[PDB]
Amino acid sequence: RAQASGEVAQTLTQADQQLSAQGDQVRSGLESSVDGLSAKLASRILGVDV
Amino acid sequence: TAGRVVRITGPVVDVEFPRGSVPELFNALHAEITFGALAKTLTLEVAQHLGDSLVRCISMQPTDGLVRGVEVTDTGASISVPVGDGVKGHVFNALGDCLDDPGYGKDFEHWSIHRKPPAFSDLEPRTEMLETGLKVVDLLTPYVRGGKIALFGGAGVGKTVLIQEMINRIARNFGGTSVFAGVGERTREGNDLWVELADANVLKDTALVFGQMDEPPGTRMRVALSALTMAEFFRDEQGQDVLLFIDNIFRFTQAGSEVSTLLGRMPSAVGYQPTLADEMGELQERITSTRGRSITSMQAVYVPADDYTDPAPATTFAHLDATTELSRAVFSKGIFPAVDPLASSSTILDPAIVGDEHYRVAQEVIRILQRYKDLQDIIAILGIDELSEEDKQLVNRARRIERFLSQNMMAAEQFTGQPGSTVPLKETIEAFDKLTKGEFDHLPEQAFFLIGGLDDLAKKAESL
Amino acid sequence: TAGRVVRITGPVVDVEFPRGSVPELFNALHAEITFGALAKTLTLEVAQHLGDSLVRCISMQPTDGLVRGVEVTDTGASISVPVGDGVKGHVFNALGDCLDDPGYGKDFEHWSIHRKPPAFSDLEPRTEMLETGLKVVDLLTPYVRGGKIALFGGAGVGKTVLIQEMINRIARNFGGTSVFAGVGERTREGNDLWVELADANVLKDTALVFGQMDEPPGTRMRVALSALTMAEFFRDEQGQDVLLFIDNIFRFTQAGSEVSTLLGRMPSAVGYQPTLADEMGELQERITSTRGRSITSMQAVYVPADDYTDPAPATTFAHLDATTELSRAVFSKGIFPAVDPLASSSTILDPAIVGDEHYRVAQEVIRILQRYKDLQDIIAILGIDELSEEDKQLVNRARRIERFLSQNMMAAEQFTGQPGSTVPLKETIEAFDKLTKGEFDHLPEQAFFLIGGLDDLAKKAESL
Amino acid sequence: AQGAQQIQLMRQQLIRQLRTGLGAEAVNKAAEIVRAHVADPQAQSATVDRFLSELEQMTSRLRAASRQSLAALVEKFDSVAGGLDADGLTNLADELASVAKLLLSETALNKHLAEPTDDSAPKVRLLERLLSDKVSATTLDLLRTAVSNRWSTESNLIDAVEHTARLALLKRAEIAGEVDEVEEQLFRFGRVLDAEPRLSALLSDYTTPAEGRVALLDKALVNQTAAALLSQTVGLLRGERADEAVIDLAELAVSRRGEVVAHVSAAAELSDAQRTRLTEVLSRIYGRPVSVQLHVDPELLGGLSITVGDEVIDGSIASRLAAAQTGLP
Amino acid sequence: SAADIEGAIEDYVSSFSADTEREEIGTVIDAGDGIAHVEGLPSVMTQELLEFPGGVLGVALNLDEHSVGAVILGEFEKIEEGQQVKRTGEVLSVPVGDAFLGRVVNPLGQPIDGQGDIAAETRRALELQAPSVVQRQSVSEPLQTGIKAIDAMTPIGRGQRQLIIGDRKTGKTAVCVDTILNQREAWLTGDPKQQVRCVYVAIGQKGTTIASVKRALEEGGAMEYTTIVAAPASDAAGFKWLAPYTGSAIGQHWMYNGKHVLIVFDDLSKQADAYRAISLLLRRPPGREAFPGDVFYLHSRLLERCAKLSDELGGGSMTGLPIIETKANDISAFIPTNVISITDGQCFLESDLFNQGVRPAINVGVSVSRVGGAAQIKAMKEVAGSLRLDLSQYRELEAFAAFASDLDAASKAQLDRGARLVELLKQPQYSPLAVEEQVVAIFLGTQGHLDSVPVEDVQRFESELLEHVKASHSDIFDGIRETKKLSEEAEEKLVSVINEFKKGFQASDGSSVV
Amino acid sequence: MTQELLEFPGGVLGVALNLDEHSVGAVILGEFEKIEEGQQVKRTGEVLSV
Amino acid sequence: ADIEGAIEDYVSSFEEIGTVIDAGDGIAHVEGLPSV
Amino acid sequence: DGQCFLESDLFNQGVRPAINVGVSVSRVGGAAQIKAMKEVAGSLRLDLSQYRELEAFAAFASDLDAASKAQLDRGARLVELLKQPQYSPLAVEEQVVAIF
Phi-psi region of E57 (alpha: psi -120 to 50; beta: other; left: phi over 0): beta
**Residue B97: which of B222, B279, B241 has the closest Cα?**
B222
- Is E268 part of a structural domain of the chain? yes
Distance (Å, whole) CA E145 – CA E321: 11
Distance (Å, whole) CA D323 – CA D316: 10
Q: Are residues B58 and B117 in the same domain?
A: no
Give the number of other CB atoms < 10 A from CB of residue D35: 15
Q: Which of C20, C43, C78 is the last residue of a domain?
A: C78
Query: What are the chain B neighbours of F32 within 8 Å (beta carbons)?
Result: 25
With 0-12 / 13-18 / 19 or more C-beta atoms within 10 angstroms meaning exposed / middle / buried, residue F25 is exposed
Percent helix, strand and coil across chain D, each to the nearest 5: 70, 5, 20
Q: Are residues B220 and B261 in the same domain?
A: yes
First to last CA, chain H: 27
Contact B147, B289 (CB under 8 A): yes
Contact E313, E135 (CB under 8 A): yes
Q: Are residues B296 and B381 in the same domain?
A: no
**Residue E480: which of E440, E448, E446 has the closest Cα?**
E440
- Is E512 part of a structural domain of the chain? no
B402 has catalytic annotation: no
Q: Within an 8 Å CB–CB cutoff, is residue D13 touching chain E?
A: yes
Q: Are residues C71 and C93 in the same domain?
A: no
Q: Are residues E207 and E63 in the same domain?
A: no
Closest Cα in chain E, distance from residue B210 (Å): 8
| DSSP 8-state secondary structure symbol assigned to residue D194 | H
Give the number of other CB atoms < 10 A from CB of residue D195: 11
Q: Within an 8 Å CB–CB cutoff, is residue E234 touching chain C?
A: yes
What's phi and psi for C150, nearest 5 deg? -65, 145
Phi-psi region of D206 (alpha: psi -120 to 50; beta: other; left: phi over 0): alpha
DSSP string, C377-403: HHHHHH-GGGS-HHHHHHHHHHHHHHH
Q: Within an 8 Å CB–CB cutoff, is residue C314 touching chain E?
A: yes
Q: Are residues C132 and C145 in the same domain?
A: yes
**Residue H22: which of H5, H43, H41, H40 has the closest Cα?**
H5
CATH number of the domain to which E449 belongs: 1.20.150.20
Comparing CB atoms, the residue among D3, D27, D33 nearest residue A8 is D3
Total length of chain F: 50
Contact C327, C340 (CB under 8 A): yes
CA nearest to F38 within chain D: D118
Distance of CA E455 to the CA centre of its chain: 33
Q: Are residues E398 and E495 in the same domain?
A: yes
Question: Does the CA dihedral C123-C128-C132-C138 come out positive or negative?
Answer: positive
Query: What are the chain E neighbours of A20 within 8 Å (beta carbons)?
Result: none
Q: Which of C30, C61, C78 is the last residue of a domain?
A: C78
Q: For residue E438, give its domain range.
A: 381-504
Distance (Å, whole) CA B390 – CA D223: 109
β-pair partners for B48: B56
Residues 366-405 on E with a CB inside 8 Å of B are 366, 368, 370-371, 373-374, 385, 392, 403
Query: What are the chain H neighbours of C331 within 8 Å (beta carbons)?
Result: none
Number of domains into which chain E is organized: 3
Cα dihedral B158, B161, B166, B171 in deg (nearest 10): 150
- How crowded is the C-beta side of B370, counted as CA atoms within 13 Å? 9
Q: Are residues B46 and B126 in the same domain?
A: no
Q: Which of E337, E354, E380 is the last residue of a domain?
A: E380
Query: Considering just the CA atoms, what is the radius of gyration of chain F in Å?
Result: 10
Q: Are residues B358 and B262 in the same domain?
A: no
Q: Within an 8 Å CB–CB cutoff, is residue D33 touching chain A?
A: yes
- The one catalytic residue in B165, B185, B232, B279 is B185
**Residue C166: which of C204, C132, C121 has the closest Cα?**
C132
- Is E510 part of a structural domain of the chain? no
Q: Are residues B44 and B85 in the same domain?
A: no
Contact E482, E434 (CB under 8 A): no
Specify the 3-state DSSP secondary structure of H14.
coil
Q: Within an 8 Å CB–CB cutoff, is residue B418 touching chain E?
A: no
Q: For residue C65, give its domain range.
A: 1-78
Q: Are residues E265 and E136 in the same domain?
A: yes
Distance (Å, whole) CA E479 – CA C337: 61
Resolution, expressed in angstroms to one decimal: 3.4
**Residue E203: which of E166, E225, E229 has the closest Cα?**
E229
Distance (Å, whole) CA D143 – CA D110: 13
- Is E67 part of a structural domain of the chain? yes
**B3-9/B12-16 β-pairing:** antiparallel
Q: Are residues C284 and C321 in the same domain?
A: yes
**Residue B232: which of B279, B187, B170, B297 has the closest Cα?**
B297
Distance (Å, whole) CA B17 – CA E293: 31
Note the maximum CA span of chain E: 88
Distance of CA H94 to the CA centre of its chain: 16
Q: Within an 8 Å CB–CB cutoff, is residue C69 touching chain G?
A: yes
Distance (Å, whole) CA C394 – CA C398: 6
- Is E511 part of a structural domain of the chain? no
Nearest 5°: CA angle at H20, between H19 and H26?
A: 80
Q: Are residues C73 and C85 in the same domain?
A: no
First to last CA, chain D: 28
Q: Are residues E403 and E484 in the same domain?
A: yes
Q: Are residues E268 and E167 in the same domain?
A: yes
Q: Which of B63, B78, B93 is the last residue of a domain?
A: B78
Q: Are residues B51 and B102 in the same domain?
A: no
- Is E242 part of a structural domain of the chain? yes
D197–C52: do the CB atoms touch at under 8 Å? no
- How crowded is the C-beta side of E40, counted as CA atoms within 13 Å? 19
Buried residues in B20-55 as b, exposed as e (16+ CB within 10 A): eebbbbbbbbebebebbebebebbbbbbbbeebbbb
Query: What are the chain G neighbours of D219 within 8 Å (beta carbons)?
Result: 6
Distance (Å, whole) CA C266 – CA E286: 9
Number of domains into which chain C is organized: 3
Q: Which residue, among B61, B187, B266, would best test binding to E if mutated, counting the most E CBs under 10 Å from its CB?
A: B187
H77 has catalytic annotation: no
- Is E514 part of a structural domain of the chain? no
With 0-12 / 13-18 / 19 or more C-beta atoms within 10 angstroms meaning exposed / middle / buried, residue C269 is buried
Comparing CB atoms, the residue among A22, A30, A47 nearest residue E6 is A30
Query: What are the chain C neighbours of H53 within 8 Å (beta carbons)?
Result: 380
Q: Are residues E423 and E435 in the same domain?
A: yes
Q: Are residues E42 and E173 in the same domain?
A: no
Q: Are residues B287 and B376 in the same domain?
A: no
Cα dihedral E204, E209, E210, E213 in deg (nearest 10): -140
**Residue E294: which of B261, H17, H40, B135 has the closest Cα?**
B261
CA distances from C452 to C86, C422, E449, H28 (A): 34, 7, 51, 31
Question: Does the CA dihedral H62-H66-H68-H71 come out positive or negative?
Answer: positive
What's phi and psi for B457, nearest 5 deg? -65, -45
CA distances from E313 to B112, D209, E131, E254 (A): 34, 72, 9, 12
| DSSP 8-state secondary structure symbol assigned to residue B447 | G
Residues 172-201 on B with a CB inside 8 Å of E are 182, 184, 186-188, 190-192, 194-195
Contact C7, C13 (CB under 8 A): yes
| E-G interface (Cβ pairs under 8 Å ≥ 3) | no
